[PDB]
Write a protein that binds this ligand. Structure first.
Ligand SMILES: Cc1cc2nc3c(=O)[nH]c(=O)nc-3n(C[C@H](O)[C@H](O)[C@H](O)COP(=O)(O)OP(=O)(O)OC[C@H]3O[C@@H](n4cnc5c(N)ncnc54)[C@H](O)[C@@H]3O)c2cc1C
Ligand SMILES: Cc1cc2nc3c(=O)[nH]c(=O)nc-3n(C[C@H](O)[C@H](O)[C@H](O)COP(=O)(O)OP(=O)(O)OC[C@H]3O[C@@H](n4cnc5c(N)ncnc54)[C@H](O)[C@@H]3O)c2cc1C
Ligand SMILES: Cc1cc2nc3c(=O)[nH]c(=O)nc-3n(C[C@H](O)[C@H](O)[C@H](O)COP(=O)(O)OP(=O)(O)OC[C@H]3O[C@@H](n4cnc5c(N)ncnc54)[C@H](O)[C@@H]3O)c2cc1C
Ligand SMILES: Cc1cc2nc3c(=O)[nH]c(=O)nc-3n(C[C@H](O)[C@H](O)[C@H](O)COP(=O)(O)OP(=O)(O)OC[C@H]3O[C@@H](n4cnc5c(N)ncnc54)[C@H](O)[C@@H]3O)c2cc1C
Lengths: 387, 387, 387, 387
């Protein structure tokens, strides 16, 4: 049970409640299996069901079936889906926030009419590829080379850490078009790869600590022909598209840790008042009361920060400093909240029959696998150095 | 330079700008001396100026010369005054929040038309006395005994930790009327004492670590005859008025830790781009960048939390759990940020010529003074036990 | 490469090096499988080899096959075994410390000659059973009943959280002997149970977050007949033998987190000088350098504290306050050190192919399992109170 | 009361007992006045008594009056003197460690008899000048020009943060003898400035947040003539002296925070069993018990670390990163311990009539003064990339 202190309107509260209701029956009872089997068998049907609620294209234009709402509703949906399951939350983020929004921002008429319709309805799954086995933070150091042989581009290289890679029908891959660039940043271009393109293949899904179920794999390009129309933006200006939405991307990414902390609380608060020790509830001891208070305060502070920054980006004033600070705070507080959740459960939180360990294993992903806290700190630092 | 991300209206932004200009012109240049001499020799003139500005009754009805605004504007004014001077911020909070709001909630019309006008105009200074030498947290265990004699009450005892005691003309003390109450709670009565009442005196001001300038002393009552009309609320019900506005009090007192953090930032950020080491600005090393990011994110999160909780209490939904969590989080983060503001200043942060140490010495009070962190943690905990 | 600053002798360093050489070829290369399969297929033969090395009875008398050494050597062996695999380290701590030492302290000549030889040689595996499905911290609220039937005892009940349960041949179980004692403490007795006893069985091994491979199950007693000679200590005096070594148990169990921290450091430090970002090694950036410094300082402090307390308990001066503080500090620092180590690997630190996640999942047991941080904190606080 | 878990010999126990018995009579009763007046009125007589005791030249040969002991006995005296007064402890660390060890290490037979025989007895007070108003951490970026004009050197410039300056008779200063070196590291030389030399002047005392009583000032040299025989080491090789006086300078300065933590504990533990709240001693509450436990464990871990690193340095094994980590841990733990002690004292911990605020204000110097947390972290990090 959340509060009205967040400042949500009725429309946003109705959305949050509907998403919670849908997840409690369609995603919540499966979170334990998805993590155990490291697979989401109903991924396609769950996507088709999410595309019927209008949350996939929550921010895309209504012209292509989207809802046309702001980024606060997107953060709410992300928080709910991550409260139901972290892996599916990360998948929804990679699909609707990294791929769809990138196309509505930089996609031209033909591409937006070809891909978005099926991307907002759930027929296609989306993925974004800007990381390599040797370039995860030094993104400009990618080693996927695309050479223009006339009206086509021959792509060769590898891409790693691609969420929804083995299930995505449309992918946005950044390939180095000219290694001889004055800055390297001016030598990368964005390409739209489709499933079935000769020369494009995927690797075996990764076995990760947490967020198991969000299929991450490697993209192998062996002389892959990409038409000249399948370029997002312009040639050699791929960094423009790469950085155009990074702030709004880290903004929506902050919803995952919020949902994980909410789930941790939803299991810690009731358990502490049922389990008893020394003749009284364990949730009545001063230490556990202070732990609960600290967890609740951290969760509420992060929630208010993220929601305020989201409302701000919805009005016109949207910066990188705050979009990075929100995620730096949320991803760093979620791990401590998860640790406290396991410490509150004790011996029962250490067995994989309770979801206390999954929350911890999933909250660390946002710290080292979706942008590092070190890079988010330096972003704010350099934003202060430029003023 | 504050950001329009917290969701402030045009009128609130203009109020903040006016307060900042007035404090930069009249209060800020003296903040260093008020702490050196442990006295604000222009206290009454500054109070009259604040009353002419209309911020001493920011939350008081317009019937008594107040502004009649919400608690968000009160938090803004407190934050600004504490950004200028923490001791004067505490003195203003002990006059407008602990005293003026205590009279517009449990005071009859006669007690209001007599004290509130001059308390809002700046002629009278206000103080609250609900703590004793042996009762800091266990406020229910008082030793200031008030025995009725006809239509008057003979008060005898001592009260400790009374802000503005030496300067207050109207103080709200809590004496113990019924020394037979099975619940001590209903054995306390609130009395409105005035400077000059025979049998009421004050001790010498305290010499505290920080907040030097907010005159705190001990009140002595020796056969103090108080009329039966100078009693706040109903006799033997002096815990209802004590808890009637404790949540709003903790909310309005959360601005001090906000102003202190904003002040340490306004000295750390400009200083890290004027000081150089190893040939480059010290604000360019990754360690200082991470420290800046951490403190800025903490300040922003605390600001969003407290501002949203204040906006909630101005709409009819005002809870005690969040009103305690905000103050706890803000008091902790303010000390944590002040400890990193002295580290970003090097040896210059250890000399009393720079304001870095004063910020820490003033922020520690919000953690140990004006309510303890353990009490707030236990309140937040017991807010879950009853559910 | 550990530092010889803790103050070890030449024989202690020889033991450290021998155990390291043995475990770098017999245990270390299997740690990834043991955690993946949740089973140590070579448990019995590895135990026979460990007993041939002379560390299973490192603190047992030479008369029964032990080594007659102190507790510092026990801590060193525990650390060296947990450095290669935390699960096998916990199993070694459960057998060599909670079972053997308990029998050499409280056992009689017959009990010391019937079990200790094979317990030290490796033929027999040992376990200790005090915890129950509803008594983890409240160790005097057990629900295992033992009714005296002439010269025998009929045991009925169950026990939970028992290390080496499915593999143990000699177990020490605490059962309630009188349900009418003024303090419950006076109605508990220890019993030496042997595998193959009519009326004793075990449950399926638990699927735990970490320490996978250290078989932990539930002991089911259904009218189990235990002779009277199998009583460990004296009937109705079970808490005296349960608290006779709790201090030394907490002391020796502190080596686990030390080994886990040493392992995460040995895996991180070399990785920071190979991985390259932005041209230079990632270990040349100030943030990673500070993280390495913090991890190294925490590890060194924990090691010094544990080793000094172990040297102290070996000379006659041994206290519960320090034996609890060492384990509390080590377990609380190991989790943060493993978190930062995962933070030092990036995406590679989130895939199960690297051992960074296993370290975090194992270090968390020493804060919830084998004791909790709150119990040790309260023990220290009450030791302070008793002064 | 100290516990003999550190592994101290009988001689060291007796030394600590004597130091405590002396400081409880001659230094402890006057610490509050020393902090208030920012001056020690019995500095010379106290020093001479400390020389008659024999703990000034503790780590110095017996020839010149020293005791001929190790660095552990030296850390013991530093801890015991900072336990009674942090400012006098810093002054003693500046005179006994930064002026006498540097003289026995890099001093000739002529210099080791003109100054040392009266620096070990207390007649002369010692200081060291490596910090200037423009370089505290970039200690290579000194600006103090020394011109060789035959049989003398002419010094011109200014220095800053000089403990014992206003009272030191001998000062080991550093000056740029060659401002055109390829590395600026080799353009520096050390000199022995004796008080009274024409040209050398001391500025006015500093008004610091803490350590009030340890007089600090600026060193102004305006054409100051120094004989060539007063050269410490050799010409244009002053970085060698500065780096030789670095590891054993960071090691011994770790007793300061240890003594401050011990002092805060000696006031918190007895005060939490006398103060009453809610009808019981505040020392019996779970939160206060956990605070006491955490403080005791941190103090004990820091003590074990510092004393083990000092025992390894008394047998030959010294390491830069270990001596930088001991203090990095001790100083960072002392501030938290002082904050927790102030929290445990409550309102009484905010008035200057209690020594908690003094402990806090003094524990922050070791994090900014005598080095920085960032510098020590970066040193420890720079100790790994080299392997
Ligand atoms: C759509 C998408 C989905 C992804 N999903 C996942 C996923 O589910 N899981 C996953 O693990 N990854 C995922 N990734 C990849 C993830 O973003 C990268 O792994 C991450 O950026 C860091 O990976 P790395 O190991 O290459 O970083 P590294 O550079 O190898 O990290 C080394 C360490 O050094 C630090 N560091 C690096 N450079 C600097 C510097 N200049 N200054 C200071 N510190 C520095 C880093 O913060 C880190 O702690 C995904 C990427 C994309 C595009
Ligand atoms: C208008 C006004 C102004 C004031 N101004 C000041 C001021 O300027 N400066 C100032 O110092 N004080 C001031 N006070 C008093 C301040 O509120 C108290 O100092 C504070 O509540 C702590 O009380 P104490 O000093 O008696 O400490 P105690 O409460 O006696 O301290 C005991 C310690 O134990 C803890 N504790 C108490 N109960 C429990 C429990 N049940 N469980 C666990 N821990 C517990 C406390 O948190 C504290 O850490 C003021 C009060 C009023 C009404
Ligand atoms: C030989 C042996 C081996 C074991 N091996 C394992 C193992 O491998 N894995 C494993 O998971 N477990 C193991 N256990 C169980 C472990 O010891 C318990 O899990 C632990 O002691 C307490 O957790 P709990 O869930 O049983 O108790 P709970 O009471 O449910 O603990 C819940 C939380 O409440 C807190 N709490 C309880 N009382 C108080 C109080 N008065 N004040 C403040 N806080 C309080 C606890 O500290 C804990 O954080 C083992 C036990 C034994 C005897
Ligand atoms: C006899 C004697 C007495 C002394 N007394 C004192 C005393 O009373 N107080 C005291 O504080 N010191 C004292 N010192 C030591 C010296 O004054 C301190 O080091 C002082 O802090 C000087 O540093 P600064 O503030 O000028 O550094 P600044 O450069 O002014 O500080 C800038 C800040 O950025 C950090 N920083 C700088 N460079 C880097 C980098 N490359 N990467 C990351 N972070 C960086 C800092 O360490 C610092 O927090 C004394 C020394 C001696 C020999």
């Amino acid at each position: 049970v959340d509060d009205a202190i967040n400042g949500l309107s009725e429309e946003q509260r109705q959305l949050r409640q509907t998403m919670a209701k849908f997840l409690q029956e369609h995603l919540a009872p499966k979170a334990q299996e998805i993590d155990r089997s490291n697979e989401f068998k109903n991924l396609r049907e769950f996507w088709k069901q999410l595309g019927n609620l209008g949350v996939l294209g929550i921010t895309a234009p209504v012209q292509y079936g989207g809802s046309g709402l702001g980024y606060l509703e997107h953060v709410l949906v992300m928080e709910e889906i991550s409260r139901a399951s972290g892996a599916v939350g990360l998948s929804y983020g990679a699909h609707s926030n990294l791929c769809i929004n990138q196309l509505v921002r930089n996609g031209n008429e033909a591409q937006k009419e070809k891909y978005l319709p099926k991307l907002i309805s759930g027929e296609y799954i989306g993925a974004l590829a800007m990381s390599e086995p040797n370039a995860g933070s030094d993104v400009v150091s990618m080693k996927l080379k695309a050479e223009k042989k006339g009206n086509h581009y021959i792509l060769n290289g590898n891409k790693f850490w691609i969420t929804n890679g083995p299930d995505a029908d449309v992918l946005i891959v950044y390939a180095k078009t000219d290694l001889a660039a004055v800055p390297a940043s001016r030598g990368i271009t964005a390409f739209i790869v489709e499933k079935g393109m000769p020369g494009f293949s995927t690797s075996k899904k990764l076995d990760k600590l947490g967020m198991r179920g969000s299929n991450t794999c490697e993209l192998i390009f062996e002389d892959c022909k990409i038409p000249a129309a399948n370029i997002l933006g312009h040639e050699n200006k791929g960094v423009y598209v790469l950085m155009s939405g990074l702030d709004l991307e880290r903004l929506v990414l902050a919803g995952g840790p919020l949902g994980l902390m909410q789930a941790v609380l939803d299991h810690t608060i009731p358990y502490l008042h049922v389990r008893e020790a020394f003749g009284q509830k364990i949730g009545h001891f001063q230490l556990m009361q202070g732990k609960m208070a600290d967890m609740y305060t951290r969760l509420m502070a992060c929630r208010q920060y993220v929601y305020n920054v989201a409302k701000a980006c919805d009005e016109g004033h949207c910066t990188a400093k705050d979009c990075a600070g929100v995620i730096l705070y949320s991803a760093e507080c979620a791990t401590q909240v998860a640790l406290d959740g396991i410490q509150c459960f004790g011996g029962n939180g250490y067995i994989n029959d309770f979801p206390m360990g999954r929350f911890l294993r999933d909250a660390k992903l946002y710290e080292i696998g979706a942008g590092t806290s070190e890079v988010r700190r330096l972003v704010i630092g350099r934003a202060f150095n430029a003023d």
